[PDB]
From a paper:
The Bmlp3 molecule consists of a helical N-terminal domain (NTD, residues 1–87) and a β-trefoil C-terminal domain (CTD, residues 88–239).
The crystal structure of the second crystal form (Bmlp3-c2) was solved using a model (Bmlp3-p21) with the correct amino acid sequence. There are two protein molecules in the asymmetric unit of the Bmlp3-c2 crystal. The Bmlp3-c2 model contains residues 5–239 in each chain. The dimer present in the Bmlp3-c2 structure is formed through interactions between the CTD domains in a tail-to-tail arrangement. The results of PISA analysis of the Bmlp3-c2 structure suggest that the dimer present in the asymmetric unit could be also stable in solution. In molecule A this loop is shifted by about 5 Å compared to the same loop in Bmlp3–p21, whereas in molecule B this shift is about twice as large and the loop is bent. Such an arrangement of loop 106–116 in both protein molecules stabilizes the dimer. The iodide anion forms hydrogen bonds with three water molecules, with I…O distances ranging from 3.2 to 3.7 Å, and with two nitrogen atoms of the protein backbone (Gly158A/B) with the N…I distances of 3.7 and 3.9 Å.
Numbering used by the authors: 5 to 239
Write the structure that this text describes.
Amino acid sequence: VPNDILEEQLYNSVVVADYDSAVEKSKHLYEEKKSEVITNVVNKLIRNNKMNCMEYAYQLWLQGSKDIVRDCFPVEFRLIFAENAIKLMYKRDGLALTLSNDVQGDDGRPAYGDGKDKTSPRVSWKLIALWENNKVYFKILNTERNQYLVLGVGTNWNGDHMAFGVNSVDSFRAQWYLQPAKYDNDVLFYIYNREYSKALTLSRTVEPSGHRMAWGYNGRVIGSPEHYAWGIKAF
């Protein structure tokens, strides 16, 4: 077996979502001094906007291969799965996501891109994996407020949903899946809601203080991560 065939095999395995055999292959290769194959494969999954890349990483993390995820994937993956604190930064506008600090309701805090704040604890978040139907999904937890990001049931005229924090996860509205992408020299992700299949985005309508409210966008984003995707920073 040449690197081409072995690589194609590993990639094929990831794309068809046969994760036990993809992990078998990886564990083999990392032992046989063939890390460049796994690394090329990651790069190709990530260039091709393949979602399976998340499940593949998580399966390595769960099956005694954290080290492969640490060495052969970009640091973001480790940041996700180690449930380290992160900042979700909207690529298009360069704002960090947060929850409002002043709320007249007892229920949920509205989410938005913070105009002044890239630093304070208010932009700290954590992603929490769960496994269902051969797929990986995430709860998104604001660390200061101990509240989960959700989309609501209501919609505006175009059919976007509001995003805000809620105390717990009892539905698919509070779950999310990631689709990796590349722009410039960095890794980005679109973030879709599990219930409604909409991407989390910031409105083009600016608030006086530079703010932009967060919405579940009803529209097409694939192809333009420099407009609709998020960077994950180590905080």
